[model samples]
Target: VDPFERNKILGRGINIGNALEAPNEGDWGVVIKDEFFDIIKEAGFSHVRIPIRWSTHAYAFPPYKIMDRFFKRVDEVINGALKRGLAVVINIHHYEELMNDPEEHKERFLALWKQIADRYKDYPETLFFEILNEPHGNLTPEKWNELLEEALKVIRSIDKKHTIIIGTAEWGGISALEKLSVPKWEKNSIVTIHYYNPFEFTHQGAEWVEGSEKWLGRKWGSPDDQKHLIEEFNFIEEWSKKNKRPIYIGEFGAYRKADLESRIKWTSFVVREMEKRRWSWAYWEFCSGFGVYDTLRKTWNKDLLEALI
Candidate 1:
């Protein structure tokens, strides 16, 4: 399928975040369960984006082999989603070393993709490969563009049929989309950007972000607040049309620190805006921070879920 049709298959997705992407399987306190896919599929989502920290589990040099156990676990998760009738998006996540020194790690990164491509070369088209999640730091647009092209080359050399999702530099923000380059040589590719705009409101009290505590009490719902999103989405929509490439919102959600009422409002607004522009999106996460499910309580946050579905 072409990029446009592949994106439609990915409609209304959610990220299974902070689990496999964590340094260890359950380090961040969420574990993947087979039943999770059942819950997700029943929730009316069409797809799941599973971010895997392949770098941490893979060898550093030469063959750069991803550990057998880790690879097996990832395959199980992907199969779980696909079997539940959800399109699956698997990506290399938080591989910080690559962002910090793209040139030094270029070959290792390519080797990783080569292995991944060869491993899943025969997988059904419902499975998609996202090149890398949220590239930033020392990986400038120029460097990211170069790495992206090389990675696509490797993936295409083995698996030319599956759709590959590519994000831009600067943490994959919409502004970064302007500098992102696509491989004209590849046809089955979707462009992606992550949105957490009006960051003060979206990231309030986010401990990992510097000075985010000061953003507490920032509220949404005003005309000015809505206008900000309109402007940003308009910019992104224009870019998509100009480039003739399909777009996906790989991530977007308010941190749990925000008031639940405001969080729901913001999430609903964001989802609706993206849907209005006909862009595919995956909410920031599943059952942890910025999540619609309370894993500990084993309950779905219905208000937030309703906001999206």
Candidate 2:
């Protein structure tokens, strides 16, 4: 599918974070129960980004064999989302070892993608493959660019027309966009960046992140704050126009420790801005730290849910 058409169908997406992406399922207080997919689709989400840490489930050998049972579970989740008529975005998430030494693990990384691409080669176009989650740590932009090209080549060899998603290094942050590189030969792809601008606001009290506590109580959404955000988005929008490549804000959200009012305001502003640019986006998560739903209560966080919608 063409980038424009694929994105139009994506419309709005939500990441099912902290579940399959965790070191182990349920380790992070979230597990994929089939019913959750129904709730997400019923809540008006047009797409679902399922982040899977394939590295943890696969072997490091030549074949890099992905555990059959694990792959089956992932298939179940993807099938569940597709059955709900949601465009599904799956990716190799949190491959810490790869980020720490891309050169050393490059072979395994490529092998993993090859397996992933080959496994879903016959799946419908709505099933998109995101090369990697957030490339940072020792994975420099230059290295990431090279790896992305190779991975794309591998995927293209198996599935010629599926829309692939690629993101910049430095954890795919907004500033990283300037350093990101995409293959000119690959027309069916989306350039992605994660948004948590003025991180002090979005990540306040996020325990998993370093220095987050220091940002606690930080507030956002003043006219000046909005202007700063607009400038950032304008930069990305201009880049997308210049490159003639569609962009996707793969992840963006405010953590729970922030005041509810601020969280809602920030999320609403970001999603509204992306919509204005006609860019696709997936909120950072559906449930857990930066979630829009309360898994325990089996309820949606109405204020937050309404903000994104």
lDDT of each: 0.90, 0.89
Task: Please report the TM-score between candidate 2 and the true structure.
Answer: 0.97
Give the Cα error of residue 182 in candidate 2, in Å: 1.0
What TM-score against the true fold does each predicted structure earn?
0.98, 0.97
Model 1: runs farther than 4 Å from truth?
Answer: none
lDDT of 1 by residue, 1-309 (tens): 678988999888999987998899899877899999999999999999998899999998798898999889988999989999999999999888888888788899899999999999999898999999988999888889988998988999999889999998888897688888897778888899999988888899999999998899888888988998999999999989998889999999998888888888899999999999889999988988788898678789889999999
Candidate 2: misplaced stretches above 4 Å? none
The deviation in Å at residue 149 for candidate 1 is 0.4
Best by lDDT: 1
State the local distance difference test value for candidate 2. 0.89
Task: Give the clash count for model 2.
Answer: 0
Instruction: State each model's C-alpha RMSD to the native.
Output: 1.0, 1.1
